DNA sequence: GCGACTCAAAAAC
DNA sequence: AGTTTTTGAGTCGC
């Protein structure tokens, strides 16, 4: 009924089929590591502006809620929340140096203003994009929004237990304890250590995330989860690392910039999950029907 | 099939 | 040791 896997930090992932077993909404059993991500491709090279050294980049993503490994498939539920977190790392550059440096895209050099992540859902069989929606903790009693592009600086990915622990923190003392895990506050650095052209000072806001944390995410309520043949559709979640540059032949998305003008989120690397099954609202997807 | 209202159970404090 | 919050999901009815 429950299949258990040991996570890297010593917590467990407990996979169960909601068609057979109903578990409370806030049970720790709802938290579990989801499907592993795989490289799709590398896109635009990034180089340090004076040394010319190529910056080696790696997305480090994980799903921490919403997906179960059931009979060799990864399964989610349309009605339910998932959590997808990601960082990135630069294997050849330590953070403190990275933030003081400046970087260009090698396309012909566009200056990188900042690095950012976005997520997307797709139909894995035909590459059609599928809308995602996020809620606040208030759910129907608060706003809905589409996942946003997240400016980020390189950081190790927090352990699964840490994501769990930080999922619903209000208390100020506890928020203080997790703050340095999730944020860099640029307004707290020594400005005299930085040049005007430094990467840190082209980030759009003083509060900069160290971790892209997409919580309370769902597939859009209108998604069709079965093919016409009644076979399940296969979906995939994608994490894309990009460099945001000033618009003034390679993959990019437009972005509403800080100063108001157009911006380009230029793709650097993309990873995706294996195929995912999503179970819809049918009574037969729930143990209650039995 | 889907928005809405609702119940309920464990986390958060 | 209580109350409030958060979130899986039961149900109504179009």
C chain positions with any atom within 7 Å of a protein CB: 5-11
Among A41, A37, A39, A43, residue whose Cα is nearest residue A242:
A43
B chain positions with any atom within 7 Å of a protein CB: 1-6, 8-13
Tell me how many domains chain A contains: 1
d(Cα A153, Cα A101) in Å, to the nearest integer? Answer: 13
- Please spell the DSSP secondary structure of A55-98, one letter per residue: PPEEEEEEEEES-EEETTEEEEETTS-EEEEEEEEETTS-HHHH
A220 CA, C14 C1': separation in Å? Answer: 20
* Residue A75, domain CATH: 2.60.40.1390
d(Cα A285, Cα A111) in Å, to the nearest integer? Answer: 50
* Token reading at A136: 């606040």
Helix or strand holding residue A181 (H, E): helix A172-182
Contact (CB, 8 A) for A35 and A276: yes
Full domain range(s) for residue A85: 1-290
A221 CA, C12 C1': separation in Å? Answer: 18
Burial (Cβ within 10 Å: 0-12, 13-18, ≥19) of residue A102: middle
Method by which the coordinates were obtained:
X-ray
Work out whether the CA dihedral A137, A215, A241, A233 comes out positive or negative.
Answer: negative
* Token reading at A110: 């566009």
Among A220, A247, A6, A228, residue whose Cα is nearest residue A122:
A220
d(Cα A65, Cα A72) in Å, to the nearest integer? Answer: 18
Q: Three-class SS of residue A260?
A: coil
A59 CA, C8 C1': separation in Å? Answer: 31
Among A193, A207, A243, residue whose Cα is nearest residue A47:
A243
Q: Kindly provide the resolution of this structure in angstroms, with one decimal.
A: 1.7
Whether the beta carbon of A282 falls within 7 A of nucleic chain B: the reply is: yes
- Interior CA angle at A252 toward A251 and A255, to 5°? 175
Work out whether the CA dihedral A201, A206, A209, A214 comes out positive or negative.
Answer: negative
Q: What is the dihedral of CA A121, A44, A255, A86, to 10 degrees?
A: 50
- Cβ contacts of A33 within 8 Å, gap of 6 or more: A5, A7, A13, A62, A63, A64, A160
d(Cα A259, Cα A272) in Å, to the nearest integer? Answer: 32
What burial letters (b/e) apply to A141-166, b meaning 16+ CB within 10 Å?
Answer: eeeeeebebbbbbbbebbbbebbbeb
C-alpha distances out from residue A244 to A98, A116, A276, Å:
16, 7, 30
- Cβ contacts of A141 within 8 Å, gap of 6 or more: none
A133 CA, B4 C1': separation in Å? Answer: 17
> Residue A230, by phi and psi: left (phi above 0), alpha (psi -120 to 50) or beta?
left
């Amino acid at each position: 009924v429950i299949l258990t896997q040991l996570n890297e930090d010593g917590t467990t992932s407990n996979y169960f089929d909601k068609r057979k077993l109903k578990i409370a909404p806030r049970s720790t059993l709802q938290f579990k590591v989801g499907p592993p991500f795989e490289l799709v491709r590398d896109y635009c090279p990034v180089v340090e502006s004076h040394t010319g050294r190529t910056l080696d980049l790696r997305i480090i993503p994980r799903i921490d809620r919403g997906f179960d490994h059931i009979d060799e498939e990864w399964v989610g539920y349309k009605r339910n929340y998932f959590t997808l977190v990601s960082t990135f790392e630069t294997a050849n550059c330590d953070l403190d140096t990275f933030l003081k440096s400046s970087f260009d895209l090698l396309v012909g050099r566009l200056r990188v203003q900042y690095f950012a992540i976005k997520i997307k859902a797709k139909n894995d069989d035909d590459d059609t994009e599928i809308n995602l929606v996020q809620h606040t903790a208030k759910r129907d009693k608060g706003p809905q929004f589409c996942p946003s592009v997240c400016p980020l600086v390189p950081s190790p990915l927090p352990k699964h237990q840490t994501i769990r622990e930080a999922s619903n923190v209000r208390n100020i003392t506890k928020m203080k304890k997790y703050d340095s895990t999730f944020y860099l506050h640029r307004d707290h650095v020594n400005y005299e250590e930085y040049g005007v052209d430094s990467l840190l000072f082209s980030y759009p806001e003083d509060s900069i995330q160290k971790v892209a944390r997409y919580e309370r995410v769902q597939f859009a309520s209108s998604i069709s989860v079965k093919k016409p043949s009644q076979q399940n559709k296969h979906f995939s979640l994608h994490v894309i690392l990009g460099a945001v540059v000033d618009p003034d032949g390679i993959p990019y998305d437009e972005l509403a910039l800080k100063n108001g003008s157009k911006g380009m989120f230029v793709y650097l690397q993309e990873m995706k999950t294996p195929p995912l099954i999503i179970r819809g609202r049918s009574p037969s997807n729930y143990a209650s029907s039995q």
